[PDB]
Design an enzyme around this catalytic site. Structure first.
Site, PDB file in Angstrom:
ATOM      1  N   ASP A  35       0.827  -1.201   0.000  1.00 51.06           N
ATOM      2  CA  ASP A  35       0.000   0.000   0.000  1.00 51.06           C
ATOM      3  C   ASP A  35       0.861   1.250   0.000  1.00 51.06           C
ATOM      4  O   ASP A  35       1.358   1.657   1.044  1.00 51.06           O
ATOM      5  CB  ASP A  35      -0.884  -0.019   1.249  1.00 51.06           C
ATOM      6  CG  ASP A  35      -1.800   1.183   1.362  1.00 51.06           C
ATOM      7  OD1 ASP A  35      -1.885   1.952   0.389  1.00 51.06           O
ATOM      8  OD2 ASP A  35      -2.441   1.335   2.437  1.00 51.06           O
ATOM      9  N   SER A 199      -0.546  15.469 -12.154  1.00 53.62           N
ATOM     10  CA  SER A 199      -0.815  15.085 -13.526  1.00 53.62           C
ATOM     11  C   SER A 199      -1.043  16.339 -14.368  1.00 53.62           C
ATOM     12  O   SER A 199      -1.560  17.339 -13.881  1.00 53.62           O
ATOM     13  CB  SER A 199      -2.038  14.162 -13.577  1.00 53.62           C
ATOM     14  OG  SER A 199      -2.439  13.902 -14.911  1.00 53.62           O
TER      15      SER A 199
END
Ligand SMILES: CNCc1nccn1C
Length: 330
Positions: A35, A199
């Site tokens: 994770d 992004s």
């Protein structure tokens, strides 16, 4: 040194991925959910409340000759999906795919919440976010990666998650046969303890690319792709009959639909998530309403590039002095 381990979907929907991890001496192998959005390595154990264990493999520290109780240490964690766990702490030898760390903090669960109990396939989590998020008190502990870093050939790990198929976590090296083209690297902020990056935009299907900064985290421990409501609405508007359902808890779509791809930007590069990756199947058994793999982050406070996004790429988690993230197509 290096390590390499195969990671396998827990079910037919890729709800999560499990990777075998050796703990203790002799080894006890548990299947852990790696994770990158948390920083605790915790396991179901011989100390876990009996009624809260249902089919998981447990760690029994009393059977490990290298286990040592970390005196006075406790831990307690809550995850973004509302689940939680807590307990005490041992140090022990932990190996992943041939890479060994001695003295790793192995957090032994005394309590786990219902969704952990109900999932027989996940024996615990192995956190790979920054150690500043580790919950052990009163002395915070380091992640497996943090402990291994100095010994690694290169201070990196990579995630290569499969779509409805196994994939690979590598530590200490970049497998240049595992991706196509080049890896595009992008800046990371560690201020919130996550692999947080920006992004450069998105496209829906064969649509034009929208240049827009989207701050979010690369999180292998989250199933879906959570993005701003504007982006998500633009995506589902291209699917006939799709709608946001408050009762179901997100966007649903007719199971008869053909889903468009979703592209996200990494610098000037582009990662394309095929439409099929965005299908999470019937909302309930036998339903013709299917759950979407792209959902709004509005109720979360952060955008999350979870497995839906990451499995479309070969992803480098570069833990150099100034960390960065790399993405390649594959
Ligand atoms: C299903 N909720 C618990 C869980 N399983 C893997 C990760 N997490 C948070």
């Amino acid at each position: 040194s290096t390590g390499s381990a195969t990671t396998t979907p827990i079910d037919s929907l890729d709800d999560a991925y499990i990777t075998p991890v050796q703990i203790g001496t002799p080894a006890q192998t548990l299947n852990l959910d790696f994770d990158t959005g948390s920083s605790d390595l915790w396991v179901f154990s011989s100390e876990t409340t009996a009624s809260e264990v249902d089919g998981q493999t447990i760690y029994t520290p009393s059977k490990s000759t290298t286990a040592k109780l970390l005196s006075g240490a406790t831990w307690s964690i809550s995850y973004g999906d509302g689940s939680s766990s807590s307990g005490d702490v041992y140090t022990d030898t932990v190996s992943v795919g041939g890479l060994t760390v001695t003295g790793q903090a192995v957090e032994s669960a005394k309590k786990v919440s219902s969704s952990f109990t109900e999932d027989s396939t996940i024996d615990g989590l192995l956190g790979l976010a920054f150690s500043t998020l580790n919950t052990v008190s009163p002395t915070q502990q380091k992640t497996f990666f943090d402990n291994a870093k100095a010994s690694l050939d290169s201070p990196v790990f990579t995630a290569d998650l499969g779509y409805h198929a196994p994939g690979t976590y590598n530590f200490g090296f970049i497998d240049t046969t595992a991706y196509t083209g080049s890896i595009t690297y992008t800046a990371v902020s560690t201020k919130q303890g996550f692999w947080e990056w920006t992004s450069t935009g998105y496209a829906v299907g064969s649509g034009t690319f929208k240049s827009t900064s989207i701050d979010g985290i690369a999180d292998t421990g989250t199933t879906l792709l959570y993005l701003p409501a504007t982006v998500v609405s633009a995506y589902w508007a291209q699917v006939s009959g799709a709608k946001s359902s408050s009762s179901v808890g997100g966007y649903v779509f007719p199971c008869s639909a053909t889903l468009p791809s979703f592209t996200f930007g990494v610098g000037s590069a582009r990662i394309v998530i095929p439409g099929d990756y965005i299908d999470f199947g019937p909302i309930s058994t036998g339903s013709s309403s299917c759950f979407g793999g792209i959902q709004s982050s509005a109720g979360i406070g952060i955008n999350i590039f979870g497995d839906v996004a990451l499995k479309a790429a070969f992803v480098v988690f570069n833990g150099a002095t100034t960390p960065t993230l790399g993405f390649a197509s594959k």
